[PDB]
Amino acid sequence: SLRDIKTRINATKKTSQITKAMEMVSTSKLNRAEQNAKSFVPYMEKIQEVVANVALGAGGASHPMLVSRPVKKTGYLVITSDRGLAGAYNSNVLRLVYQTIQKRHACPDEYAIIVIGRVGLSFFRKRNMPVILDITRLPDQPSFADIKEIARKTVGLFADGTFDELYMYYNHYVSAIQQEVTERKLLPLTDLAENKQRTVYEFEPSQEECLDVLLPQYAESLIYGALLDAKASEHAARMTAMKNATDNANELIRTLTLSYNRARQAAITQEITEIVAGANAL
Amino acid sequence: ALAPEIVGEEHYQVARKVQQTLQRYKELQDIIAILGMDELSDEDKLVVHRARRIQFFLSQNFHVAEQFTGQPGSYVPVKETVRGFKEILEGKYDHLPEDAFRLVGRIEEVVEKAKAMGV
Amino acid sequence: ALAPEIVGEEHYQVARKVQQTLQRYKELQDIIAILGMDELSDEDKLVVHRARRIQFFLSQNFHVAEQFTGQPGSYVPVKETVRGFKEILEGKYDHLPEDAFRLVGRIEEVVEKAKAMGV
Amino acid sequence: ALAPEIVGEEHYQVARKVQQTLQRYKELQDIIAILGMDELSDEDKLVVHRARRIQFFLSQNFHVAEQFTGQPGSYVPVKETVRGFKEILEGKYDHLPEDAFRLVGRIEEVVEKAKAMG
Amino acid sequence: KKVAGTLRLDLAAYRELEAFAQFGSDLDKATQAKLARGARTVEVLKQDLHQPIPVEKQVLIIYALTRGFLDDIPVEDVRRFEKEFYLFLDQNGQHLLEHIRTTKDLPNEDDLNKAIEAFKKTFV
Amino acid sequence: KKVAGTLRLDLAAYRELEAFAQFGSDLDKATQAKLARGARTVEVLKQDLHQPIPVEKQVLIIYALTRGFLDDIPVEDVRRFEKEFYLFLDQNGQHLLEHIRTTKDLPNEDDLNKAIEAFKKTFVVS
């Protein structure tokens, strides 16, 4: 129908202009985070190496965070998008976390879930899993202080023995089209960084007390590192989907446009032939 | 006759403002049909909110619809129609559920019809 | 002849149920054509997986196709045809990949064609 | 007629590169509409530099525009434009102000027009 | 001629840019500024039924929109303001108008800038 | 018939596959391999104006590509190899060319494998 196809050609054009809008705004936020991720890498290297060097050099394993223990029960931290329209950034991480418990788990009680992102909480509310902590509505530019208090809650749950082993599941930014579902073990610190270059350190702070400061500061540092990779990889995901979405829409506009032209030519010939057939009769 | 002099300034203001709301809802329905309603801004959400109510409140219970719809029927004087449509546009009655605006006469009735539903 | 009396109840529940899955796929054709399958949720995802299985399992290898493609042909008796659709509809073969469901005769043939790939 | 058996191979190659150079510049235009020049890679910045000169060197000072503007105007033989665009495409002349290429004739005119600025 | 050249270009940029970016507010300040002129321009082009405007007054309001004195003013009350700048011009600015009709030409920029800047002080 | 009843499988599948993979987030090793073989065929099917290739030379170049030896050569070098192979057959490999014309049939696979490895030693890259 000529009226129906004209409306369709009009409808697609408007939505092509919106998908192009979203490509440009996501492109612009990517640069800031890509720059933010650079800027915090110098901070991340400074803190993580000095605290590792004092934790692993000139001393034994005498911290609950350093020492391995047999696992009575465990937890998972999974970080996901609040807003939708991102392509598979949310799914491929949920697929790995769900399979990892379902393939290896024999009790609901065995595992607990910490979640960042509305789509993660939604997936857990559908199907069925419990959630111990479920933070949401974070800004598009994440700050350290947002997860300062939320991390404080998580390290309290670990440090008091509620979970004996804890894993992070998040996306890692590698390339402009390729991004990698990654699994990390937040605690215990069964392994540690080693600069191999150390200097005399003050022996006045109690070693356990001195650690009491540096272990949580390392833990917060690791979690914040995952947020800079997670937000950089999201914006990128939205950008890729929007490019392909716009390219599919513009292709559909040329295919639809030809059907309209074919029809307009067709009707014109019909009306003329009915007119001339009656004129020939009379 | 929709000219300010032949109907008054208060009438004309409300009439053209309704016509902006319903033209904005028409273009926005294409975006909703393909991309989805949650994707859009607070001003775009508030347009769709009000346009649904305005469009259903244009429906009315007639006396010749006694045979077709059971309910008896209503006559709305012009002064009342302007008051009510102004309230919808200013948002006073937005708390009520949308299903109460169908086949009714005056805005007073819409408040009661909602009470039966339980709101 | 697709009448519960002529073809029997079993061949009947199965035929209509196949049509119901496929008709939903046409409605979802014009959404998945732009955004892909991120927009789809829940039942939409499961319905598209089973529709892909069904649409390739309606394709066959013919003895008269031997003059075009080197494969041998297959004849599928009706009791096998009706039985095969059920297991696809239940979801008993969800794990196997879509490229193993093309140009095959009776259902077993899909299992050996999948095993050749190992996917 | 843009084919190597009609024009000859050197003319065909110089034309193909010019179109490649410009089409890549147009991709960077929508990125430059959102963002700054130094946010690109140095490979894309080289494409912008050369393309912007080519577009301006494509322009030309016409004779029938003489009445409207004092500038006299020029005619370029096909061998001279093919030679000149080959020099821009090796970058022999890249150490020159951009507007030196505006409304000019042979490539040697750019040299002198540059001196005019200083 | 001198006053209107910028307007045709300004309107074209709003057509392309707004048709995507009305929704995205938290963005590059250049795009945000460009989208303001488009909107104000659409109001300055709006007009009432059966009320024609003489040419000298048209060139003055367009010199303002093009020169951008109107940025400070919200988009909404441009309609009422456009009629009112007209009051100030009649009572005070007789010299600028006398010249335009007689010379078909624009007066000295410093004097125009002085008159329009002074009215921008008066407006609330 | 023996050589290329299968070229369509590489071409039909490759043309469609490159559409999904460009937009595609990931490729399995099986998909990545299919792509490489397909890539050479398109370049092997590129020709030039007014230059026909005799049929005995066609079946020999298609055998290499359909035998996995041609995969070693890089995309841009495939074209030179095809010219360089046709010349190598004229100067050196006359026995293979006599058999196909006379008996309309593939020559010794072992001689052809031996022969194709012998050409590949002489060929150089970039």
PDB file of C-alpha atoms in Angstrom, chain C residues 7-79:
ATOM      1  CA  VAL C   7      -5.171 -36.567  10.164  1.00  0.00           C
ATOM      2  CA  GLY C   8      -5.737 -37.588  13.798  1.00  0.00           C
ATOM      3  CA  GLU C   9      -5.282 -35.656  17.063  1.00  0.00           C
ATOM      4  CA  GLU C  10      -1.533 -36.248  17.339  1.00  0.00           C
ATOM      5  CA  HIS C  11      -0.772 -34.941  13.834  1.00  0.00           C
ATOM      6  CA  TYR C  12      -3.060 -32.072  14.759  1.00  0.00           C
ATOM      7  CA  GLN C  13      -1.855 -30.577  18.031  1.00  0.00           C
ATOM      8  CA  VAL C  14       1.633 -30.762  16.422  1.00  0.00           C
ATOM      9  CA  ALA C  15       0.709 -29.031  13.149  1.00  0.00           C
ATOM     10  CA  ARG C  16      -1.077 -26.035  14.698  1.00  0.00           C
ATOM     11  CA  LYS C  17       1.632 -25.655  17.365  1.00  0.00           C
ATOM     12  CA  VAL C  18       4.267 -25.424  14.575  1.00  0.00           C
ATOM     13  CA  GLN C  19       2.254 -22.652  12.873  1.00  0.00           C
ATOM     14  CA  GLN C  20       1.973 -20.697  16.145  1.00  0.00           C
ATOM     15  CA  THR C  21       5.759 -20.550  16.654  1.00  0.00           C
ATOM     16  CA  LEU C  22       6.390 -19.522  13.045  1.00  0.00           C
ATOM     17  CA  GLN C  23       3.733 -16.730  12.937  1.00  0.00           C
ATOM     18  CA  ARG C  24       5.316 -15.047  15.970  1.00  0.00           C
ATOM     19  CA  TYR C  25       8.638 -15.124  14.076  1.00  0.00           C
ATOM     20  CA  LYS C  26       7.124 -12.948  11.248  1.00  0.00           C
ATOM     21  CA  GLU C  27       6.009 -10.300  13.797  1.00  0.00           C
ATOM     22  CA  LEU C  28       9.534 -10.299  15.247  1.00  0.00           C
ATOM     23  CA  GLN C  29      11.073 -10.074  11.710  1.00  0.00           C
ATOM     24  CA  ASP C  30      10.673  -6.306  11.436  1.00  0.00           C
ATOM     25  CA  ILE C  31      12.127  -5.583  14.911  1.00  0.00           C
ATOM     26  CA  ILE C  32      15.182  -7.904  14.654  1.00  0.00           C
ATOM     27  CA  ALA C  33      15.934  -6.483  11.161  1.00  0.00           C
ATOM     28  CA  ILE C  34      17.200  -3.203  12.742  1.00  0.00           C
ATOM     29  CA  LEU C  35      18.434  -3.614  16.340  1.00  0.00           C
ATOM     30  CA  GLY C  36      19.267  -7.338  16.460  1.00  0.00           C
ATOM     31  CA  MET C  37      18.383  -9.587  19.373  1.00  0.00           C
ATOM     32  CA  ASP C  38      19.473  -7.359  22.269  1.00  0.00           C
ATOM     33  CA  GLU C  39      16.029  -5.668  22.321  1.00  0.00           C
ATOM     34  CA  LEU C  40      14.262  -9.033  22.594  1.00  0.00           C
ATOM     35  CA  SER C  41      13.581 -10.371  26.100  1.00  0.00           C
ATOM     36  CA  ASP C  42      12.633 -13.658  27.744  1.00  0.00           C
ATOM     37  CA  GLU C  43      10.048 -15.505  25.593  1.00  0.00           C
ATOM     38  CA  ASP C  44      11.262 -13.596  22.502  1.00  0.00           C
ATOM     39  CA  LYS C  45      14.715 -15.201  22.821  1.00  0.00           C
ATOM     40  CA  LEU C  46      13.391 -18.715  23.337  1.00  0.00           C
ATOM     41  CA  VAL C  47      10.887 -18.406  20.455  1.00  0.00           C
ATOM     42  CA  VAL C  48      13.555 -17.234  17.984  1.00  0.00           C
ATOM     43  CA  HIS C  49      15.853 -20.151  18.918  1.00  0.00           C
ATOM     44  CA  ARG C  50      13.116 -22.736  18.320  1.00  0.00           C
ATOM     45  CA  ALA C  51      11.864 -21.038  15.123  1.00  0.00           C
ATOM     46  CA  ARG C  52      15.401 -21.261  13.612  1.00  0.00           C
ATOM     47  CA  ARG C  53      15.461 -25.022  14.414  1.00  0.00           C
ATOM     48  CA  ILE C  54      11.999 -25.614  12.859  1.00  0.00           C
ATOM     49  CA  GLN C  55      12.629 -23.619   9.675  1.00  0.00           C
ATOM     50  CA  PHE C  56      15.816 -25.575   8.826  1.00  0.00           C
ATOM     51  CA  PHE C  57      14.320 -28.959   9.829  1.00  0.00           C
ATOM     52  CA  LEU C  58      11.591 -28.535   7.118  1.00  0.00           C
ATOM     53  CA  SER C  59      14.338 -28.792   4.403  1.00  0.00           C
ATOM     54  CA  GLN C  60      15.115 -32.180   2.753  1.00  0.00           C
ATOM     55  CA  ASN C  61      17.537 -34.071   0.471  1.00  0.00           C
ATOM     56  CA  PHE C  62      15.808 -35.274  -2.761  1.00  0.00           C
ATOM     57  CA  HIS C  63      16.774 -38.107  -5.146  1.00  0.00           C
ATOM     58  CA  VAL C  64      16.112 -35.651  -8.034  1.00  0.00           C
ATOM     59  CA  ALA C  65      18.587 -33.163  -6.501  1.00  0.00           C
ATOM     60  CA  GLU C  66      21.451 -35.634  -7.084  1.00  0.00           C
ATOM     61  CA  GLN C  67      21.934 -34.014 -10.571  1.00  0.00           C
ATOM     62  CA  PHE C  68      22.803 -30.682  -8.788  1.00  0.00           C
ATOM     63  CA  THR C  69      24.344 -31.657  -5.389  1.00  0.00           C
ATOM     64  CA  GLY C  70      26.288 -34.896  -4.811  1.00  0.00           C
ATOM     65  CA  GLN C  71      24.321 -35.965  -1.675  1.00  0.00           C
ATOM     66  CA  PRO C  72      21.949 -39.005  -1.659  1.00  0.00           C
ATOM     67  CA  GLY C  73      18.224 -38.493  -1.077  1.00  0.00           C
ATOM     68  CA  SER C  74      15.899 -39.412   1.832  1.00  0.00           C
ATOM     69  CA  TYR C  75      12.255 -40.519   2.255  1.00  0.00           C
ATOM     70  CA  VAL C  76      10.720 -39.668   5.679  1.00  0.00           C
ATOM     71  CA  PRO C  77       7.566 -41.652   6.646  1.00  0.00           C
ATOM     72  CA  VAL C  78       4.765 -39.674   8.357  1.00  0.00           C
ATOM     73  CA  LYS C  79       5.043 -41.295  11.776  1.00  0.00           C
TER      74      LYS C  79
END
